[PDB]
Amino acid sequence: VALALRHAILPKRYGSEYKLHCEWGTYGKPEHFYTDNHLSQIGAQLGFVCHLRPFKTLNDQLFSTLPGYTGARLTLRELEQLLVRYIVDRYNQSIDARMGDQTRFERWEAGLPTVPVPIPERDLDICLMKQSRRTV
Amino acid sequence: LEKNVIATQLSEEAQVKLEVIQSLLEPCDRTTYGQKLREAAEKLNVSLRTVQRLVKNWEQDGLVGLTQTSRADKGKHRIGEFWENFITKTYKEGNKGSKRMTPKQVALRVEAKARELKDSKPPNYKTVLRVLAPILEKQQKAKSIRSPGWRGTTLSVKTREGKDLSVDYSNHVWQCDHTRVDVLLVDQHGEILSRPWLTTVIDTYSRCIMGINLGFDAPSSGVVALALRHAILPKRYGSEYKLHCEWGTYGKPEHFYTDGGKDFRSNHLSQIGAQLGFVCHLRDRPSEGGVVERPFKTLNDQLFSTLPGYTGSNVQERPEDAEKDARLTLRELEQLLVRYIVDRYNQSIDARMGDQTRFERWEAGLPTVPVPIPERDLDICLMKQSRRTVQRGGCLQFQNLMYRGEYLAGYAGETVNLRFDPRDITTILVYRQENNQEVFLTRAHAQGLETEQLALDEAEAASRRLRTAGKTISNQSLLQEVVDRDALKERQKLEQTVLRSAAVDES
DNA sequence: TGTACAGTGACAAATTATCTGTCGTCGGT
DNA sequence: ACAACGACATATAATTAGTCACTGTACATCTACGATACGTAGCGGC
DNA sequence: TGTACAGTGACTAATTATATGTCGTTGT
């Protein structure tokens, strides 16, 4: 969960290999974060409140169509590329009935009271995985 | 540079502060936020000003701002600098050279100076240990430092010249050094001899053991010449070795990289190298050649520690029964050690790689299959007498022995290069310079000894005895001073007899 | 960038003496 | 009238210096020495 | 029941950087 949070917060900066057309432009600290002491520390470290639906479309629009769908081979990295391409150029470019004019990304942008300032990368190190002992 | 800090093991008090901060994450209104502070002052038993300080420490540091920071004096000593420098330098001077002064002894030097200065509070011994503690840990750490290793197929062996040899393929760089084995052996009668010497020749590209010599004999340019011919010539072992794979390893190095021992920095090895065409090189430190030094630990660990008569790696680990519990002769130990090298060691995984055996990597690593050298052309192993001159009557003098040769009377007054075998000096091969090249001349023979065989160390021991006996110099006279000392024992002769019995089994 | 094997923490899988229910049974009131 | 910050005084645990009982480990003949090499000097025979 | 000294945990006294109040001042 902390790794998913780190990604969300930081700028994305994806490689040419994903062959994306659109930019994944979000970044930023929320006011609240809802989840399934560690996450509450992270909330207190970063300054937001921890509390304790794109699945339907991932299945229909991406996964059920892929090699090896569990009712051919596919590596983890390839699946990531497919998933990012789907999210940056299709899912977030879709318009819901409740938005009408604006896409999921556009409404996101459109609704901000202000452009947040990116959190320097180091302040998110608390999210990363850790090995506790190594010898130099 | 970047400067981040992260808290860990937070909870023990801090979870109470964390729950207070979680209750305070938002300035909801000037009316309500003050009430939340005055409520949090029930969970922490402290005033509004303590909770306002906690919130400021949190906002400026994050989670470490909940934890109590260590005092600014932590690791500083209250005794004053004079005593802190006196104690540190006293220790250091007292462990200079061979001196090994203990902290207790440093404390005595502290009480001695304090008495001179009329001090009343010389630091206590317990505080001397504490002041010297950091500079002891450093010493222990500086001994313990690990080094990584060559990783993958690329390896650059450092020489004493500061040049690195890039090891590109099998037989590009062989390496050689010598070790005592850690087992006391016995003669064929079951009496103690001595711990053999083992020589190995390792190819650096494959780490396969390309040859050995095992014997009671001393490191010598002779033992190195024997290790080289065993490494170079194709190998054959009988069924009494019970081998189940073949040591199919042979051919000639391009370079030979060694320690600084007088066996290797010698005119004899240089003459072997110049005739075989390989260049000798000097190992810069005993840690650049782990390719040769680590095989010797593996053999202690995999072979020799499990044999009777084992002596330990040093005198403090010597099994007290080693001198009573010796059983093997040199012929048994070789029959075990050769098996170990052919069936186990050369068939084990090359550790840098993880997916090849040492032999498989050698065989696949040849740039081409080399042609076996006729055993007669391994004569180059012969030692050279550089500049002896032919006497009138077609004669040569060497080691008191006098030699006669089939065309040699044609060259009285001239200079000839004599090639000889330290195992058999009865015969001498004579070469001469012509057109600034060596040309072969003749097989000179010790006159009246054509039916007889003398090794160099026998002619030498006979000459020493003959000099001190005051008798005359002649071919027989030297033979006479051999045959009584032969017929009539001394450990070196007893060792030589068992070593000979192994060489007989090689024929 | 020494080297390579013996020994060692951290973790996953198979096995088992043990903890928890549920009901039946016996004893006390 | 409410919230934030400092000047100052005051109580407080963290760190260090010192004390003392319990305990691990060397004292127990023992590495200067053997075995090569080169490099140079010397003894009498010629 | 070997032996006797250097090093070490468990505890305590001395020193001090630091958290806690109380109130004055400033901003809102």
Added chain:
DNA sequence: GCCGCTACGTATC
């Protein structure tokens, strides 16, 4: 005065 064989000094494993 010139030249093969011994003997001592120094270095390293």
